[PDB]
Amino acid sequence: ETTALVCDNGSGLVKAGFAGDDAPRAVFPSIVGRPRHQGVDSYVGDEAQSKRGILTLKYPIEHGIITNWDDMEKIWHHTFYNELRVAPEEHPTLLTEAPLNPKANREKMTQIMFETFNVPAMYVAIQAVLSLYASGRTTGIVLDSGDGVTHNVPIYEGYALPHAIMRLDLAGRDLTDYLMKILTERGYSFVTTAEREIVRDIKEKLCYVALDFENEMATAASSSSLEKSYELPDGQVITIGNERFRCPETLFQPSFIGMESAGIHETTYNSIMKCDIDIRKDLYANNVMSGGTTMYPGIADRMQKEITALAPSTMKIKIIAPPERKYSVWIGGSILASLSTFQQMWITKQEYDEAGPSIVH
Ligand SMILES: C/C=C/C(=O)C[C@H]1CC[C@H](C)[C@H](CC(=O)NC[C@H](O)[C@H](C)C(=O)NCCC[C@H]2O[C@@]3(CCC[C@@H](CC[C@H](C)/C=C(\C)[C@H](C)O)O3)CC[C@@H]2C)O1
Ligand SMILES: Nc1ncnc2c1ncn2[C@@H]1O[C@H](COP(=O)(O)OP(=O)(O)OP(=O)(O)O)[C@@H](O)[C@H]1O
Ligand SMILES: [Ca+2]
Ligand SMILES: [Ca+2]
Ligand SMILES: [Ca+2]
Ligand SMILES: [Ca+2]
Secondary structure, eight states, X not given: OOOOEEEEEOSSEEEEEEBTBSSOSEEEEOOEEEEOTTTOOOEEHHHHHHHTTSEEEEOSEETTEEOXXXXXXXXXXXXXXXXXOOOGGGSOEEEEEOTTOOHHHHHHHHHHHHHTTOOSEEEEEEHHHHHHHHTTOSSEEEEEEOSSOEEEEEEETTEEXXXXXXXEXXXXXXXXXXXXXXXXXXXXXXXXXXXXHHHHHHHHHHOOOOSSHHHHHHHHHHXXXXXXXXXXXXXXXXXXXXHHHHHHHHHHOGGGGXXXXXXXXXXXXXXXXXXXXXXXXXXXXXXXXXXXXXXXXXXXXXXXXXXXXXXXXXXXXXXXXXXXXXXXXXXXXXXHXXXXXXXXXXXXXXXXXXXXXXXXX
């Protein structure tokens, strides 16, 4: 066939699909399972998830960086052959990487696409910058927060400013774990692997960011107005009250999970302050949120409040939170891969043959 592919590999989820679609058609867990003793060769994604229990399950991307290459090769095979139902040798493939991904790492991605999958052409794009593009901008500061890592990435005239990038190893998995902890403290039992998945769903369905933590805690202590009932698959019902906003509060106050790090408002400010003073105005007016961990209701308003408190009193602050932002990286990749002016930028199989891996730089 013909259509270019966009594969946005994350710590928790693979988002894959065809350039020109408006969302990824294949979204599945970035997990590879190989047989346990009871099992007695490899499974990926939803099937791995459902056959977990007779598999040893591994995440090949850790905090946004590919670390297990053999399992990553399995992910990509499943992506092409099982999910997209394509022959990879027939489709140019755009892949994504984390900010500050080592050069040796982008090179191994490239070596594998060509030497294992025989793709005709490929490209590796930085995730946060693709999210900025998806919002129609070439200058701004992205907060990209997923399952495994959070970054602040200031971007000027199309390209990230690497000296000002901030990485925080606090993201959605840590929030899921903390929700599990605080639900356990309330008296619920969430221990099994099935139960951890339930907690992730609760997080995604019911959590939100309070505008002011203390005020919200006081409302929750004196009223039922913030309570929600959540129905488990087996029919059991639990009440979630202040856990709804205590969970994502950790993004702003990482001390809730024992981390000494600055919160996401502070890392955003600190990143802007590492940039030339003459571009800061434009960064402040173009803070784009990306990634599943930015999906909490209330997060934009809270960011607005917190950045306003840190920034000069006359600064225009604007937080942009696209509704599609679980998929902003992928959408930016799709938009980019379609541009007429991008077609020259693909690395072709023939160019790889002459130069070797470092051509991707
Ligand atoms: C000159 C230096 C280049 C570098 O890559 C240096 C690196 C060194 C390391 C440093 C950390 C930084 C990294 C970086 O930002 N890389 C680029 C990044 O991967 C993005 C996704 C990309 O590949 N982007 C490629 C964009 C290619 C497009 O570039 C343009 C110019 C720049 C802005 C870009 C905007 C494309 C989007 C899809 C369109 C939008 C937002 C319209 C305006 O709505 O178009 C013209 C068309 C062209 C096809 O920059
Ligand atoms: N509505 C929501 N509310 C809160 N969290 C959400 C919501 N939807 C998804 N998430 C969380 O977003 C995360 C997945 O987001 P995303 O796909 O951007 O991450 P990733 O790319 O796999 O990881 P990373 O970018 O950290 O490598 C998960 O932790 C998931 O639970
Ligand atoms: Ca991601
Ligand atoms: Ca307070
Ligand atoms: Ca703290
Ligand atoms: Ca200057």
